[PDB]
UniProtKB/Swiss-Prot annotation:
Protein's UniProt keywords contain Glycoprotein: yes
Positions of glycan attachment: N209, N265, N329
GO molecular function, one term: serine-type endopeptidase inhibitor activity
Assembly and binders: Forms a heterodimer with TMPRSS7. Interacts with VTN. Binds LRP1B; binding is followed by internalization and degradation. Interacts with PPP1CB. In complex with PLAU/uPA, interacts with PLAUR/uPAR. Interacts with SORL1 and LRP1, either alone or in complex with PLAU; these interactions are abolished in the presence of LRPAP1/RAP. The ternary complex composed of PLAUR-PLAU-PAI1 also interacts with SORL1. Interacts with PLAT/tPA. Also interacts with SORL1, when complexed to PLAT/tPA.
Highest taxon listed in the record's lineage: Eukaryota
Record lineage: Eukaryota, Metazoa, Chordata, Craniata, Vertebrata
Induction summary: Up-regulated by coagulation factor Xa (F10) in atrial tissues. Up-regulated in atrial tissues by rapid pacing resembling atrial fibrillation.
Record-given protein name: Plasminogen activator inhibitor 1
Site (Reactive bond): R346, M347
Family under the similarity heading: Belongs to the serpin family.
Protein species of origin: Homo sapiens (Human)
Amino acid sequence: VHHPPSYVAHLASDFGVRVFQQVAQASKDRNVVFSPYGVASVLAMLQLTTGGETQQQIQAAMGFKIDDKGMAPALRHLYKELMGPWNKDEISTTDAIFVQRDLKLVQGFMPHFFRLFRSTVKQVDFSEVERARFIINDWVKTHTKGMISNLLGKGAVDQLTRLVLVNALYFNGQWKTPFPDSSTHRRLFHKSDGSTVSVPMMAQTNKFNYTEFTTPDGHYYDILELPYHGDTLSMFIAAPYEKEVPLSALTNILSAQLISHWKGNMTRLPRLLVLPKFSLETEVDLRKPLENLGMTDMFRQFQADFTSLSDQEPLHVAQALQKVKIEVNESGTVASSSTAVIVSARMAPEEIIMDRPFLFVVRHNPTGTVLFMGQVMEP
């Protein structure tokens, strides 16, 4: 049969990309970075802590059950394949479950959780507000290699917080063929908010894997693959021929299978690759996207079923978010992701910036794991 890590890699990516598709369709030309892999990781953990219909909705949307024979082992085998030194470029992924030590957990849960994710259940005391927040933020900061140091802002969690599932994803890759110094080739980006910014324009002529793609509405899209030196990972960049064609035409059809198809339809052709030097730092509220995918029970107090975790008290997902940071430069790309699902928490209203952007996708090709994807303002 197929290589198991590849199997779950696609299932996880398919789900995460569908989640991204939701955030894109909700905000036209939204400038954002997202991690399909990260959202899939935490949601897989949510499957075990959740039960009844709430659990059935997650599994339906995700398209698989973490409890199923060979599911968790394959996902673990994937973490290892992704993080392996043989990739040259580095990926670091770690999951964590923070439960209120008080919270009387259902019999068999804790040892069963460790069995599937190995992440080891961490019992904390949320009543010590500032202490619990530090413990979780410090964990994230550590596992994102310092990139995301403040996932949980002040007031984010409190005595009422009972659970918080988190995924820390870190990626540091070096271009197979770097770009020359772009500090003297800066352009004026006139943002929609009425401001102008000077963005360095990296440019290089070389042969890159490329393929053309037409949407249902017959629009032509430029799909270019910019590989990382390890040749296992690469950044697929997508841009329409006509600067009149909205990116929505692409994201409304964007899927993990499509991206997979893009890769297979490529040929090394010479092109003058122009890529702006940027650093995008956004935080996505995953509530609506997940709800849109059918996971509504989890957010509603008197409907959410966390009986697999504990049947001591009623529990429901208060906040579901993903903080992502991406730094693209002449040398390579440094990306980090922190997605969390918190039972009882206050999340600062989602900031949504919109400026006609282009699409990019960081992907681990051997397994087909799309780690990152986002939209950055096109010059």
